[PDB]
Every structure is written in C-alpha cells, then in structure tokens.
Amino acid sequence: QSAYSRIEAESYSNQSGIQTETCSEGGEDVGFVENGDYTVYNNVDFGDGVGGFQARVASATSGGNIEIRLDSSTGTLIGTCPVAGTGDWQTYTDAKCTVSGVTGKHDVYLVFKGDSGYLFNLNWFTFSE
Numbered sequence: 001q002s003a004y005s006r007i008e009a010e011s012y013s014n015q016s017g018i019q020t021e022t023c024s025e026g027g028e029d030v031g032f033v034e035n036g037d038y039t040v041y042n043n044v045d046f047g048d049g050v051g052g053f054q055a056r057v058a059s060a061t062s063g064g065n066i067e068i069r070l071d072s073s074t075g076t077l078i079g080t081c082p083v084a085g086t087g088d089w090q091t092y093t094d095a096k097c098t099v100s101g102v103t104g105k106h107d108v109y110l111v112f113k114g115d116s117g118y119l120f121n122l123n124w125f126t127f128s129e
C-alpha cells in the first residue's frame with residue numbers, strides 16, 4: 001500500500017491493546033488507546049519523497065503522541081505526531097508532523113504514547129511528499 005494513500009486506521013495488519021468502533025464521521029475509528037498501545041500497517045511503500053504525516057484524530061482528554069516507527073514496535077523512529085484534545089471522542093481534527101527521510105517498503109507501527117487514561121481515537125492517516 002502506498003504511504004501517500006489514505007490509510008484507514010481500522011485496516012491494520014496487527015494491533016496491540018486497541019478496539020475498533022463506530023466513527024461519527026463515517027466508517028470506524030481505532031479507540032480505547034492507552035500509553036503503549038499500537039497498530040501496524042504492513043508493506044507500506046514510501047518510494048523516495050516522504051516529508052510529512054497527517055492523522056485524523058479525536059480526543060476527550062489531552063491527546064498524546066503518535067510515534068511513527070518502522071518495522072517493529074520499538075523500531076527506528078521517523079516522526080512523532082502530537083495530538084491535542086478536541087473536546088469529544090467523536091469530534092475530529094487533523095494532527096500533523098514532519099517525517100524523516102525514508103525509502104522503500106516498511107511495516108509502519110503507530111505507537112501511542114502519553115499521560116494516563118485514554119489518549120485519542122484515530123480515524124485514518126496518510127503521509128505527504
């Protein structure tokens with residue numbers, strides 16, 4: 001799958017600790033996110049050109065960070081996307097960050113880190129050139 005496509009969060013290959021649920025904007029979100037949870041998207045093709053990451057997120061708390069790691073849940077970090085409260089678990093906004101240069105095909109781990117409690121819900125994400 002292309003890094004530059006819209007990747008629905010619920011389309012993960014593997015996950016730890018989360019649950020999918022009905023998303024107010026349509027489709028599903030990955031919710032029940034606590035510090036240390038993650039989702040994995042296999043065989044993402046970055047080509048040569050990546051510069052950024054955009055995630056569609058909601059949070060009734062104070063959010064947290066999405067660590068973007070390659071090939072394992074503790075693997076090389078290529079960006080950390082800050083996520084901020086939106087006042088409701090089903091009112092979404094765009095969280096965005098820069099991403100270090102990378103090439104080729106990798107399994108992408110989105111590793112959710114933050115304070116105590118639930119962090120945010122993730123509807124979909126994408127990378128930008």
Ligand SMILES: O[C@@H]1[C@@H](O)[C@H](O)OC[C@H]1O
Nearest residue numbers: 031032033089118120121
């Ligand atoms: O959306 C989820 C909500 O349904 C649950 O009650 O709290 C955790 C959130 O992620």
Ligand code: NA
Nearest residue numbers: 008009028123
């Ligand atoms: Na979704």
